[PDB]
């Protein structure tokens, strides 16, 4: 139940970068759980609150 | 875990006869013809569950 | 009489051409700055810009 403290292991995070137009193909898609993510710069919560 | 199949799905045995070449908007797409409705769907998108 | 209106301090030929310019500057064909986009995931068989 407790909040984790040590850095947890995570699924690999493939970054789809969808544009105006693109040719989606699904050969060699991974079967393991995976994090689809559309944007590059998602480390957006920078401003720390002591 | 084995995800249960959803209420709307139709069971369909795979067979080489189901899949074929076809014209669809100037491309030779790999159409699948649904055995019940008989309808051909060239695109992987929009096929019946 | 020349003082009653500045006429924006432009010559009469300038105002006359100017009205034609105003016809030019509102023609729908020139208005190729477009406003707003629809985002929608969708196969692009048979494209047409319209």
Swiss-Prot record, chain B:
Signal peptide: none annotated. It comes from the Viruses. It is found in: Virion. Inner capsid protein that self-assembles to form an icosahedral capsid with a T=2 symmetry, which consists of 120 copies of VP2, with channels at each of its five-fold vertices. This capsid constitutes the innermost concentric layer of the viral mature particle. Belongs to the turreted BTV-fold inner capsid family. Homodecamer; each decamer is made up of two conformers of VP2, called VP2A and VP2B. 12 homodecamers assemble to form an icosahedral capsid. This is Inner capsid protein VP1. The chain holds residues 1088 to 1136 of 1333 of the full protein.
């Amino acid at each position: 139940d407790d909040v984790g403290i040590m850095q947890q292991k995570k699924p690999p995070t493939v970054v789809q970068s969808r544009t105006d137009v693109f040719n989606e193909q699904f050969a060699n898609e991974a079967l393991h759980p995976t994090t689809k993510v559309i944007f590059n710069g998602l480390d957006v919560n920078t401003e720390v609150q002591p | 875990f084995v995800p249960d199949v959803p209420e709307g799905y139709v069971a369909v045995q795979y067979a080489h006869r189901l899949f074929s070449s076809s014209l669809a908007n100037k491309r030779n797409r790999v159409t699948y013809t649904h055995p019940p409705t008989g309808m051909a769907y060239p695109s992987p998108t929009g096929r019946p569950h | 009489e020349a003082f009653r209106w500045s006429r924006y301090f432009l010559d009469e030929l300038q105002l006359r051409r100017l009205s034609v310019g105003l016809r030019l500057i509102t023609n729908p064909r020139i208005a190729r700055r477009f406003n707003g986009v629809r985002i929608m995931y969708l196969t692009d068989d048979d494209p047409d810009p319209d």
